[model samples]
Target: GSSLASQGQNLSTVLANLTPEQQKNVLGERLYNHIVAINPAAAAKVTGMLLEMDNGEILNLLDTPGLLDAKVQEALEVLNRHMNV
Candidate 1:
């Protein structure tokens, strides 16, 4: 299973050098893209991991700025069944 602690830790490490906004932009976009490219089963697994990690704030960030509103909302409904906001 994807560990939220581990994922948050990794995200923290990766963003150590970046400003908060930059981290939100670059990392969020990359992660969103990765999720979009994965198979449904894999995306489900990752979504579970993400929720476990309590990365809802990341999702919110993605909802607002990482992905376009229409695309992100569409994906949220199709993939996760809920929006971050």
Candidate 2:
């Protein structure tokens, strides 16, 4: 199990390196708004997997520079909760 603080910090650090355009295009403007829209729960699981794999990709963008971590986390949690049903 991962602590939220560790996750947040890791995410923040990774996000610090991305260009605004890269952050927007690669992380923000695409996956969450587009791909995730198709299937929210699947997107959450996929996002979780991505986060686990990259250790910060989604959280990095949505959390730090974007500063939308709480909303993103809520979305993921909603998706995750419904996924088990």
Candidate 3:
């Protein structure tokens, strides 16, 4: 909403211009980006991670840095650990 509204577009009107999937995409990305940007780094380690919550049965903390890690440590670790080379 903020991304579209910064262009001086109203919420309902802008939303009407988006499809259901696109609507969900922006709403989701905006929150993620906003959290990453405005978190003030109280827990900076988790800044670049995504949090997924399901019912009461699920629990985990995964460090999946993929392409974002500066030195590709995570991607390398995955390859090496599985390949065991």
Residue-by-residue lDDT tens digits, candidate 1, 1-85: 6655534366678766667678655654465456656443334433443433234444555553443333334345455554564
**What overall lDDT, based on C-alpha atoms, would model 3 receive against the true structure?**
0.34
Model 1 has an lDDT value of: 0.48
List ranges where model 2 is wrong by over 4 Å: 1-29, 51-85
Q: For residues 1-85, what per-residue lDDT tens digits would candidate 3 score against the true structure?
A: 5455344456769767768668555544543454344342311222222232221112122222321232133223332233322
Q: Which stretches of candidate 1 lie over 4 Å from their true place?
A: 1-18, 39-85
Q: Distance (Å) between predicted and true CA of 55, model 2?
A: 13
lDDT by residue for model 2 (31-82), tens: 5554355555555554444444233444555543332344445456555554
- Deviation of model 3 at 24, angstroms: 1.9
- With a 3 Å backbone cut-off (N, CA, C), the pairs that clash in candidate 2 are none
Task: Give each model a TM-score.
Answer: 0.30, 0.27, 0.24
- lDDT to native, each model: 0.48, 0.49, 0.34
The CA lDDT at 82 in model 1 is: 49
